[PDB]
UniProtKB/Swiss-Prot annotation, chain B:
Record text on subunit structure and interactions: Binds to host ACE2. RBD also interacts with the N-linked glycan on 'Asn-90' of ACE2. Cleavage of S generates a polybasic C-terminal sequence on S1 that binds to host Neuropilin-1 (NRP1) and Neuropilin-2 (NRP2) receptors. Interacts with host integrin alpha-5/beta-1 (ITGA5:ITGB1) and with ACE2 in complex with integrin alpha-5/beta-1 (ITGA5:ITGB1). May interact via cytoplasmic c-terminus with M protein. May interact (via N-terminus) with host bilirubin and biliverdin, thereby preventing antibody binding to the SARS-CoV-2 spike NTD via an allosteric mechanism.
Superkingdom of source: Viruses
Task of the protein: Attaches the virion to the cell membrane by interacting with host receptor, initiating the infection. The major receptor is host ACE2. When S2/S2' has been cleaved, binding to the receptor triggers direct fusion at the cell membrane. When S2/S2' has not been cleaved, binding to the receptor results in internalization of the virus by endocytosis using host TFRC and GRM2 and leading to fusion of the virion membrane with the host endosomal membrane. Alternatively, may use NRP1/NRP2 and integrin as entry receptors.
Name of this chain's protein: Spike protein S1
Effect of residue 33 to P: In strain: Omicron/BA.1, Omicron/BA.2, Omicron/BA.2.12.1, Omicron/BA.2.75, Omicron/BA.4, Omicron/BA.5, Omicron/BQ.1.1, Omicron/XBB.1.5, Omicron/EG.5.1
Glycan-bearing residues: 3
Effect on the protein upon substituting residue 31 to F: In strain: Omicron/BA.2, Omicron/BA.2.12.1, Omicron/BA.2.75, Omicron/BA.4, Omicron/BA.5, Omicron/BQ.1.1, Omicron/XBB.1.5, Omicron/EG.5.1
Amino acid sequence: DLCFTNVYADSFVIRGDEVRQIAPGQTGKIADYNYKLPDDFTGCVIAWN
Amino acid sequence: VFNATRFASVYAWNRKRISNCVADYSVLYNSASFSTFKCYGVSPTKLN
Amino acid sequence: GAISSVLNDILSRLDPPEAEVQIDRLITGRLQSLQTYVTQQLIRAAEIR
C-alpha cells in the first residue's frame, strides 16, 4: 500500500552459520572485516540455501 | 585454561582466581577457535 | 534503573546501540528532578510577592 523512492540491491554469498552476522547493530567476523549495516538501516535481507 | 588437559563438569565446579598481571582480550575474539563469544555487561571492543 | 550514575561509565563499557537505552533512563529521571525545582520555586515566588 505504501512505497518509497528507490531500492538498492547488494548481493554476496556467505557460509551456513553467517546468516546471523548480516543484521544491524552487532559485530562479528563479517560485521568487522567484510560487510556491516548501519544502526538506522531501514530494509531487510532474504537468504536461500 | 584453554590448553589444559582435563576439564570438570557441572556437578564439580572449577574456580581459578587470576590477578596482578597484564592480559590481551583481542586474541580471544579473532582466533578461529570458538563460536559463541557474546557478552552481557561489557562490550568486547571496550575490554582493552 | 540504569547500571550506573556516571555517564562516562556507560559510554566506556557499552556499545552505542545498547548505551543509548541506559542513557535515556538517566535523561528522563533527571528532567523530572528539574521540573520539580522550578514548580516549587514558582509558588515560593508568589508567597514572597
